[PDB]
């Protein structure tokens, strides 16, 4: 299952100044970028056009170009409309796309955040506020829902265009999406908060895809004190992760870090301290 996400970030500093920047993800791989200073959407993969013809892509891009300008003015007008309830500066984020399931099934979404809080979605045939949203948004929703043309366009984009486009992306991008990159590991140590304690660190870098197993071990005994950090990105669309273990000074000898990853083909990495 792959989630396609179009992420829009719009800053409105005051009545005059604004910028909108977008990035597009298929799973954890970036497929598009659209900078405020660019007239056109940028491909970040050879296969970012999917299976769309040039005419189909140009038409789709045109729709987005009209959208970006129209969106900017509409926010500025909505601020005037709700004045002086809401004032600049204002951040608006959109998360839109579709989740792809087997048997050509899919679910589409369009979520909107105002000042970093999820307040609005498109659902069915209309815009709606979500639980917890402030009541003043009811007027913007009324105004947005008066626009039958936008409603019809969004319905088509979410229901039809998104899944069709993404099906083609998955085909065109197969070899990148299914790439295997091997982890490399290395060990290190630092003093912890405790007085006479050490903190061993197993560094694991360069692996793709994300799923990985990393455990400190004394022989066949998995050390339960093992603490995985967060998954951190490398610049080359691989992943980095470190697993720590708080131990007593002197007890380092005997410990080893074992790494299991799909890319290694059963040949686990074992590093002895």
């Amino acid at each position, epitope marked *: 299952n792959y989630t396609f996400r179009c992420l829009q970030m719009s800053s409105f500093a005051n009545r005059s100044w604004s910028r909108t920047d977008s990035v597009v993800w298929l799973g954890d791989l970036q497929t598009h970028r659209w900078s405020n200073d660019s007239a056109t959407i940028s491909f970040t993969k050879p296969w970012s056009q999917g299976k769309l013809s040039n005419q189909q892509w140009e038409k789709l891009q045109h729709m987005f170009q*009209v959208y970006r300008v129209s969106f900017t003015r*509409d926010i500025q007008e*909505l601020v005037k409309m709700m004045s002086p309830k809401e004032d600049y500066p204002i951040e608006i984020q959109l998360s839109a796309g579709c989740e792809m399931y087997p048997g050509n099934a899919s679910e589409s979404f369009l979520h909107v955040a105002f000042q970093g809080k999820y307040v609005v979605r498109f659902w069915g045939t209309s815009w709606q506020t979500v639980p917890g949203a402030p009541s003043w948004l009811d*007027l913007p929703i009324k105004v947005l*829902n*008066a*626009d*039958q*043309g*936008t409603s019809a366009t969004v319905q088509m984009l979410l229901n039809d265009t998104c899944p069709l486009f993404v099906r083609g992306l998955l085909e065109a991008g197969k070899s990148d999406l299914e790439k295997q990159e091997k982890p490399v590991a290395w060990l290190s140590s630092v003093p912890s908060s405790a007085h006479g304690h050490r903190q061993l660190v197993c560094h694991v870098s360069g692996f793709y895809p994300k799923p990985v197993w990393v455990m400190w071990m004394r022989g066949d005994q998995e050390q339960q004190g093992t603490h995985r950090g967060d998954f951190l990105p490398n610049a080359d669309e691989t992943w980095y992760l470190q697993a720590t273990l708080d131990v007593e000074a002197g007890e380092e000898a005997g410990l080893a870090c074992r790494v299991k990853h799909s890319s290694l083909g059963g040949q686990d990495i074992i590093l002895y301290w």
Partner: T-cell receptor
Amino acid sequence: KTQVEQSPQSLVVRQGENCVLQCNYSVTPDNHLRWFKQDTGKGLVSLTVLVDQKDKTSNGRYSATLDKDAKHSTLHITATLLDDTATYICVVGDRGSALGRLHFGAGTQLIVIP
Amino acid sequence: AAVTQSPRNKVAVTGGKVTLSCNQTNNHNNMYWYRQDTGHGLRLIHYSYGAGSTEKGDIPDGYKASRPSQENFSLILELATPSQTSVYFCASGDEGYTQYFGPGTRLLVLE
């Protein structure tokens, strides 16, 4: 100069003759286009509103077309009467809501000779 | 959905104060002031999204707008000039795109 241009600027027809009025625009986006009739020193009377990519409407002796790809509309008047003497104004609305701005043409002056 | 304007016709002198009024009982949030000059389409001067709201249009200079209530939207020429000789139209509407126009006001500013 402007985003909405009408042609001809003016015309004179004899009673019973048909005529065609043109509106060309550069407005983006183009949600809808309306034709108004304005009698001398009077107000704006809506004749028709066109909304579809390729639209056709009618209202008695008035009929209109819209081609959003060419950004072009025509108003046809069949069998002109003295009371058709007026200015005809093309307006493009850039939104399907109150967030829209209206973009007005400068009008075509029609005189019908009785 | 009806809209009225007062006065319907006004002769004023340069430097004098002129107030053009527009009333609608449609309970429309939104009201709009335009002027119509020969050789031009109607041009937006000021508009309002509700009582207390006034917003500049395309040609606001020399005009002040006032929205004291939902019903009334006024255009104020503080220091009238001959360039403000025109026909002025007010419109109202709700969240929909339709603007419902008043019958117009003719203003002549003499020297």
